[PDB]
Design an enzyme around this catalytic site. Structure first.
Site, PDB file in Angstrom:
ATOM      1  CB  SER A 103      -2.034  14.327 -13.505  1.00 42.88           C
ATOM      2  OG  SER A 103      -2.442  14.100 -14.842  1.00 42.88           O
ATOM      3  CG  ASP A 131      -1.839   1.164   1.336  1.00 44.38           C
ATOM      4  OD1 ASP A 131      -1.976   1.925   0.360  1.00 44.38           O
ATOM      5  OD2 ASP A 131      -2.440   1.340   2.426  1.00 44.38           O
TER       6      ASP A 131
HETATM    7  C1  D6S Z   1      -6.973  -0.305   3.896  1.00 47.34           C
HETATM    8  N1  D6S Z   1      -7.659  -0.276   2.571  1.00 47.34           N
HETATM    9  C2  D6S Z   1      -7.430  -1.552   1.816  1.00 47.34           C
HETATM   10  C3  D6S Z   1      -8.215  -2.711   2.366  1.00 47.34           C
HETATM   11  C4  D6S Z   1      -7.666  -3.980   2.412  1.00 47.34           C
HETATM   12  C5  D6S Z   1      -8.397  -5.048   2.908  1.00 47.34           C
HETATM   13  C6  D6S Z   1      -9.683  -4.854   3.368  1.00 47.34           C
HETATM   14  C7  D6S Z   1     -10.235  -3.595   3.332  1.00 47.34           C
HETATM   15  C8  D6S Z   1      -9.508  -2.526   2.833  1.00 47.34           C
HETATM   16  C9  D6S Z   1      -7.357   0.978   1.743  1.00 47.34           C
HETATM   17  C10 D6S Z   1      -8.269   2.196   2.128  1.00 47.34           C
HETATM   18  O1  D6S Z   1      -8.970   2.652   0.994  1.00 47.34           O
HETATM   19  C11 D6S Z   1      -8.120   3.621   0.366  1.00 47.34           C
HETATM   20  C12 D6S Z   1      -6.900   3.700   1.275  1.00 47.34           C
HETATM   21  O2  D6S Z   1      -7.464   3.284   2.539  1.00 47.34           O
HETATM   22  C13 D6S Z   1      -5.802   2.708   0.894  1.00 47.34           C
HETATM   23  N2  D6S Z   1      -4.465   3.370   1.005  1.00 47.34           N
HETATM   24  C14 D6S Z   1      -5.877   1.520   1.852  1.00 47.34           C
HETATM   25  O3  D6S Z   1      -5.014   0.486   1.396  1.00 47.34           O
END
Ligand code: D6S
Length: 330
Positions: free
Chosen positions: A199, A35
């Site tokens: 962008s 992430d």
């Molecule tokens: C924690 N989320 C992924 C996720 C993984 C598994 C289950 C639910 C969600 C996302 C959330 O949506 C946008 C931002 O925050 C992002 N950076 C993050 O990865």
């Protein structure tokens, strides 16, 4: 050093991607969501509330000879989608695709929100934004990339996400066989802790390119492309029957439609997102209403170049003293 790992969509829609990560001694392999929009490495664990674990592989620090409790350290994170998790912290050996970091902060979940429980394929997250966003208290911890950086051949990692297919995260080198043409590099602001860039504009389908600055973040952990309402309206206006549905929570379109491409600018370069990438399928099983992959950022506070955009490119996250972002077609 370098590392190279394959990343794999969790489902047929590319809702997220998981990458195998080795934690501890002997290795415990967990599939983590890399992430670039957050900076905590956290895992489902033997410490996670039992009722909140449903199919995930857990990290058991007691079975790792190299695990050590980071005494007094706790963490708590809430994400932009409303999900959350929290717990305590161990340090342990973490390896990604052959690249090894000793003394990595591994944040052990005691609590996770329902959205994490309900996703059996994701065993945790591996944050790759800047370490200034890390939530560990009272001593903030470094990301896997920051810890690895000095040892890497080059202080970079790259994201090469597949459309309905596996892709690759590389650390410490740029695979010049993985993209076409040249990589266009663009300035990054780290002021909010993100890979934030601007962008140069957009086009819808075969339409003329609109030069306009769009500030946003490169976020591998976000599924869709979130852009200003003006831009998003201009896109969906080219799809007969498309509309924003409050009840669904965004733009939907007739599943019988053929979606136009979407182009975004990187300096003078252009990245083209094929229309198929923007299809996220029936809103519910059997429905003829499909969910759009380009949505308004109006209720977020920031534009997000998520997987829909990033999977259309070879993306370089350059962690030099002055960080930059590179995009190439592929
Ligand atoms: C924690 N989320 C992924 C996720 C993984 C598994 C289950 C639910 C969600 C996302 C959330 O949506 C946008 C931002 O925050 C992002 N950076 C993050 O990865």
């Amino acid at each position: 050093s370098t590392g190279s790992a394959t990343t794999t969509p969790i489902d047929s829609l590319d809702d997220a991607y998981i990458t195998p990560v080795q934690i501890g001694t002997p290795a415990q392999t967990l599939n983590l969501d890399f992430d670039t929009g957050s900076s905590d490495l956290w895992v489902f664990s033997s410490e996670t509330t039992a009722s909140e674990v449903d199919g995930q592989t857990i990290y058991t620090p007691s079975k790792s000879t190299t695990a050590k409790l980071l005494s007094g350290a706790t963490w708590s994170i809430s994400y932009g989608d409303g999900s959350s998790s929290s717990g305590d912290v161990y340090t342990d050996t973490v390896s990604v695709g052959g690249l090894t970091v000793t003394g990595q902060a591994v944040e052990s979940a005691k609590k996770v929100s329902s959205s994490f429980t309900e996703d059996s394929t994701i065993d945790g997250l591996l944050g790759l934004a800047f370490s200034t966003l890390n939530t560990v208290s009272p001593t903030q911890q470094k990301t896997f990339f920051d810890n690895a950086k000095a040892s890497l051949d080059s202080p970079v990692f790259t994201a090469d996400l597949g459309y309905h297919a596996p892709g690759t995260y590389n650390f410490g080198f740029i695979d010049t066989t993985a993209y076409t043409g040249s990589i266009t590099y663009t300035a990054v602001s780290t002021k909010q802790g993100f890979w934030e860039w601007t962008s140069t504009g957009y086009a819808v389908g075969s339409g003329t390119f609109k030069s306009t600055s769009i500030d946003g973040i490169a976020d591998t952990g976000t599924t869709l492309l979130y852009l200003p309402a003006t831009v998003v309206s201009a896109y969906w206006a080219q799809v007969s029957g498309a509309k924003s549905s409050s009840s669904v929570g965004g733009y939907v379109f007739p599943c019988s439609a053929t979606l136009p491409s979407f182009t975004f600018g990187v300096g003078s370069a252009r990245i083209v997102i094929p229309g198929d990438y923007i299809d996220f399928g029936p809103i519910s099983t059997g429905s003829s209403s499909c969910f759009g992959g380009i949505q308004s950022s109006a209720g977020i506070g920031i534009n997000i170049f998520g997987d829909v955009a990033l999977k259309a490119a070879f993306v370089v996250f350059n962690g030099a003293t002055t960080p930059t972002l590179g995009f190439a077609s592929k």
